[PDB]
Structure 1
Amino acid sequence: ARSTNTFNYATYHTLDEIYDFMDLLVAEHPQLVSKLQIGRSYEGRPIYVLKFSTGGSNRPAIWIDLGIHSREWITQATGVWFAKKFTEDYGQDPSFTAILDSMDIFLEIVTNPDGFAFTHSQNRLWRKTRSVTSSSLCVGVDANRNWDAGFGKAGASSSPCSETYHGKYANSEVEVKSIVDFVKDHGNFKAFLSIHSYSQLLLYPYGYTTQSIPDKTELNQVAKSAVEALKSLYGTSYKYGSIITTIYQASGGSIDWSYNQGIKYSFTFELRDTGRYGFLLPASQIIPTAQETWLGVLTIMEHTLNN
């Protein structure tokens, strides 16, 4: 792909293709997009975030990350599509234009680059990072169990060989600490969205505790509105609710952490499907998934801009 206009959005790509895509995009829309390196992975690959902004100084922002679990390929694919869509819709879509005119969007397409490279080279279903666990033969940590939110409580495994291993301590994974430092340093994030697959769910906090968040009514109403928007295109049906009541008890998850930092609009999307293909969703479903997920995300952004 010589231009972001010739990149194939309807197929799954490797890490290099996605990193090359980032530079094409910046080159084409220098005034709107910037590439930031917020850290380096365990195996030393750069960790990149795309910043979409029309100016200002430390405008309130929206965080969106994809690919924290490497095998959920539909998420990195949706992230690439979103990056392109942002550049297409600014100045065309009134709603999206109003958002970018007042807020910045930070997009992390490949949150776990080492695991992503591993899914391409050796094990398509790899979920964790690739950090070497000292007193074990088992590699990696579930980066979505490593956050400082009920860290180590029920909903995570203490065994290094588990798919849900939480790691030695909160934020032990550089892929996680890189995000934590960046968001803490920025201090003006208003929304935090973390995308996964599969199950077709829209979740809000909490996963580590049965306690209800103080903003439950509002977040529930936003979730309802976002799922209605998403369903409007292809009829894809999503359920919504707090993590613990909807999926399962899970400790150390990112949105529990972000909400505890005061970032009210903290949500996780679990993309298509419901099990027919699961992690191996056909390339033919990439665009439809991305398009409908965009309506759900845009709904949340609109609420953020106004409240």
Structure 2
Amino acid sequence: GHSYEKYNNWETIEAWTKQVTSENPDLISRTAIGTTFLGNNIYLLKVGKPGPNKPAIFMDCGIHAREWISHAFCQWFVREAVLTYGYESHMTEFLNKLDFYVLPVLNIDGYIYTWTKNRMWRKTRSTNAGTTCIGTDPNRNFDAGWCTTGASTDPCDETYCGSAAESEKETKALADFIRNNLSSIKAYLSIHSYSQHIVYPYSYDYKLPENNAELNNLAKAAVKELATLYGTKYTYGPGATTLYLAPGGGDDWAYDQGIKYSFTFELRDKGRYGFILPESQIQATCEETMLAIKYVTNYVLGHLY
């Protein structure tokens, strides 16, 4: 049984991707962009009112297995889109003018593993040569300053970069999709947890992006919009500058492909519950995050390129 106010297992999320598409055929279409290491279909939802030459926003959740609130947020975004389209001015305009490529769970194998064996699992579930240690960090596997300082060369480590850039089927599937739809994608959004932080490029090196001033102002305003609902405090800035060196990230790779609006959203909380954020907080966390996501969407729509 699926619920937007509860954490749902992969079988429930997969069934939901099929049901939400069939219940809303004029707003949602579903495709499989590839398969995981264990052979699970990587589903992608195209959310928006169909039309010609439409710009798009790409959003992924569940790159990291244990970050259950991120998987919950992608489902909440789709929930909001189908519930408020035709009922709220902004969401109506967004779905008419833009398409949202929502990837509810990127690291499906890791997500199944958090439900079955280890709640605190982070990486993929792929095998590594010369060791029994499992998985690669997908957010250290993209081809953007790949496997430099901030990523580990050790397969037993949580930040393992992989055997090569895009060695993971999941990373290659996401990268292939963006490369194939690059002319349409205007924004990249990666949903994670926890720290209450909005990251923008660069994370693979200590360097500021070309549009640093613009991204600083946009993140500042998105953080401000998020706080209006419950007073939740978010920090923001370039990845390497305000968080840590994290090379081979999807956001930096997307930015270097020409997607100048690229953000990583680290959701609730600040360490009290960490990855084990209670189900009672899903509603509040998702509703406030919606305000930041809608602010960025509105900005992108007013600054098309």
TM (normalized to structure 2)? 0.97
| 1:145 and 2:140 matched | yes
Q: Is the 8 A contact 1:58 1:186 kept in 2?
A: no
Q: Provide the aligned C-alpha RMSD in A.
A: 0.8
Amino acid at match of 1:127: R
| 1:213 and 2:205 matched | no
Match of 2:121 among 113, 121, 126: 126
**Structure 1 residue matching 2:79: 3-state secondary structure:** helix
**Structure 2 residue matching 1:154: 3-state secondary structure:** coil
With 95-104 and 163-172 compared, the bigger mean Cα shift is at 95-104
Amino acid at match of 2:245: Q
Corresponding residue number in structure 2 for 1:194: 190
Q: Is the 8 A contact 1:49 1:109 kept in 2?
A: yes
Q: 1:58 to 1:138 in 2, by over 3 A?
A: farther
Question: Structure 1 residue 145: deviation in Å?
Answer: 0.3
Question: Structure 1 residue 9: deviation in Å?
Answer: 1.7
Match of 1:184 among 175, 179, 185: 179
Q: Is the 8 A contact 1:99 1:301 kept in 2?
A: yes
**Structure 1 residue matching 2:275: 3-state secondary structure:** helix
TM (normalized to structure 1)? 0.97
Corresponding residue number in structure 1 for 2:71: 76
Corresponding residue number in structure 2 for 1:25: 20
Amino acid at match of 1:216: N
Corresponding residue number in structure 1 for 2:243: 247
Corresponding residue number in structure 2 for 1:56: 51
Query: In the TM superposition, what whole-angstrom CA distance separates every residue of 1:163-183 from its partner, at most 9, and x where no partner exists?
Result: 000001110111010011111
Match of 1:256 among 247, 252, 257: 252
Amino acid at match of 1:55: P
Match of 2:36 among 33, 41, 55: 41
| 1:159 and 2:154 matched | yes
Corresponding residue number in structure 2 for 1:291: 287
Corresponding residue number in structure 1 for 2:234: 238
Query: In the TM superposition, what whole-angstrom CA distance separates every residue of 1:147-189 from its partner, at most 9, and x where no partner exists?
Result: 0110011010000000000001110111010011111111210
* Alignment partners' CA distance in 2, 1:96 and 1:13: 25
**Structure 2 residue matching 1:278: 3-state secondary structure:** coil
Query: Can you give the 5+ residue segments of structure 1 that lack an aligned partner in the other structure?
Result: 2-6
Identity %: 46
**Structure 2 residue matching 1:280: 3-state secondary structure:** coil
Query: Can you give the 5+ residue segments of structure 2 that lack an aligned partner in the other structure?
Result: none
* Alignment partners' CA distance in 2, 1:98 and 1:81: 19
